[model samples]
Target: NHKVLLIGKMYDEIGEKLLAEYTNVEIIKEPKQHQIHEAIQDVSGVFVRYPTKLDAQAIGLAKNLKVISTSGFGTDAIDIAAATKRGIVVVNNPGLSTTAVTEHTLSMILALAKKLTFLNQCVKAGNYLIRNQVQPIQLEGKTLGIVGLGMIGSAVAKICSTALQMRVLAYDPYVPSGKADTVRATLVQDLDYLLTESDFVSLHPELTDETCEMFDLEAFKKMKPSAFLINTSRGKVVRQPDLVTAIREKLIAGAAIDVFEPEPPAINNPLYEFDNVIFSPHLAGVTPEAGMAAALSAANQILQVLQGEKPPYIINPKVW
Candidate 1:
C-alpha cells in the first residue's frame, strides 16, 4: 500500500502491473525534471522507464523514497551517486528481457543482410521494381563483431555461433579473453581489428563516457564496404551523424538501428532518407512477456528494499 512514482508507458499486459496497482501512482509519460521533483515528493517508491532522470536535484525532494527501480538494464540516466548518498536503494531488471532482445537483434541483422525492410517499404510504397536494385546476403559463415560481451552480447554470440554458424569477433576490454571462448567467440584485443573484419557489427554495450559515440565515421570506414551494422544496445554509442554519412557514402552496406540519441529523434532526422537502413522506435526490449516480467522484478525489489533486504541484486552493492 506504499505510495509509488511510475512515469512511463502503460500497456495492457506487460508494463505497469505493480506500479499500476498503486492507488497514488502518478503517471507522467513525458516528465520534466522539475515535474519529477514535484511528483516524487510524497512517494515512498519510484519505478521508472528510460526517459526519467532521477538525479540529485529530483531525488532530493523525495525524502520518503526508499527504493528506485528501472524497467530495463541501463542505469546511466539515474544518478546512483546521488541516490546512494541519500540512502536510497536502487534496483533494475537486466535478465528478464534477454531473450526478447536477442531475437530482436538477430531480426535486425537478418533484416540488414536480407534487405527485408527496404523490400517491405518498397512494396508498401508501390515500388516493387526497386527491389531488384538491392542485393541481399546470407548469414552463415559471416563474421559477427560484438561490441560488448555482456549478458545480451554473450547470448547473441552463442546463438549466432551455434545456430547460424557465424564466426564471432568480440571486443570488450572489461571482459576476460577466456569468457568469449565459453560462448565460442574469439576475443579481439583491438576494436579496429574487429571492426575491419566482421560482416555484421552489433552494439550491445551500455552508454558511458568512454563508450559514448564510439562508432563514429572512422569506425564505420573501418568496416567492410559490404558489411552491415546492427545495434540493439544504447543509441548514442554510434554517432548518428557519422552513421548517416557512412550510409550516404556507402561506407557500409546498411544498418538496422533500434535505439536513437535524444529518443524520438528530431522530426527531420536524416536516417529516413536511406532505404537500406531499418529504424525501430526502441522496441527491441519492449516485448509483452519481457516488459511484464521486468516490471514484476522491479516491484519485488522495491518491496525487498522497503522491508530491509540485504545485498543480492543491488546494482550499487558497495554503496551499502
Candidate 2:
C-alpha cells in the first residue's frame, strides 16, 4: 500500500480526511530527526509542517517518495533541488495566507503607530494621566514603503493607501514597474530611496540569497529618525542585532516584529527590554482560516501526486 507520512503536529481531521481517503496515512507529532529519517524510508508522500525540515539527507533515505508538500507557502524548509533531481514533485500552498498575513501586518503597523503597548502599560499601571505626554503619529498622507511588491505587499499597499490615506512606495526590482500601479504605489528602483522617503517601512520579501539579512544598521540609518519599521516576513530578512542597535540609538522610532530568525527567539532576547518594540510568535500566517486553507491545500497536493495526478501548486514543475 502507498503510504503518506505527515511530519509535525498538523490539523488532524483535514490531513486524515484528504490524504487518507486513498492511501494509508501515518502522522508523527513533534518527531525527532532520527524518527523522521526512519519514517521517510518507506513513505510515498510526505507533508511537512512548520520548523520541520525535509532536507537532502532525509530525501536520500526515501525508497519510494513521489511528492513533498510544505504546510505553507514557503518551500525553504525542503530542499527543492534535491527533490527535483530525483524527479519528485515539490508542492506549496501559494497565496493561501496572503490575506491573513496582510491583515497581521496592518495590525502591527497600527499598534506601533499608536503606541498601543506603551499606552496600555501606562493605563494599567494607574498612570492614566500619562496621556498628556503621549503623542501618536497619524497615518494620513504619510508614506508607507513596502519592500516587496508581491501579493501581500501589494495588498498592504492598496489598503493603506485607500483607507489610511497614506502614500505607498514600493521597492521590488523583480516585479514589473506596472505591478505597483494597481495599488497606486510609486515603484522605486532603489531600496535606499524607499527607506529614506517613507515614514513606516514594511518588509514582505521572500527569504533568498539576495534578501537574507538585507536590512541592517545601514538600512536603518537611512530611515527618518522618527520613522517606524514593520516586519511580518521572514526573520532572516532583518539583522536582529542591528535592529537592537537601531532601537538603542533611536536610529528609527520603533519596530513591530512578527517573525524571528531562529524562532522562539532566545529566552534572553535583548529586544524584550525595549518598550517601543512589539512582537508576535510568527503567527502572521497562522489565523484559523489561513491554517485551514494551507493545511487542506498541502494535503490535497500530496494526494494529487499520490493518486497519479499533477498537483495544482507544484513548485518544481520541471520534475513532471
How do all models score by TM-score? Answer: 0.85, 0.89
Please report the candidate that would top lDDT against the real structure: 2
Q: For model 2, what is the alpha-carbon lDDT of residue 174? A: 94
Error of 1 at 83 (Å): 3.5
- Who wins the TM-score comparison? 2
Give the per-residue lDDT digits (tens) of candidate 2, residues 98-191.
9999999999999988999999999999999998988888999999999999999999999999999999999997988888989989899989
The lDDT of model 2 is 0.89
How accurate locally, in lDDT, is each candidate? 0.83, 0.89
Clashes of 2: 0
Model 1: how large is the Cα RMSD against the reference?
A: 3.1
Superposed model 1: Cα runs more than 4 Å off: 9-28, 31-38, 55-58, 79-82, 174-178, 208-210, 311-319
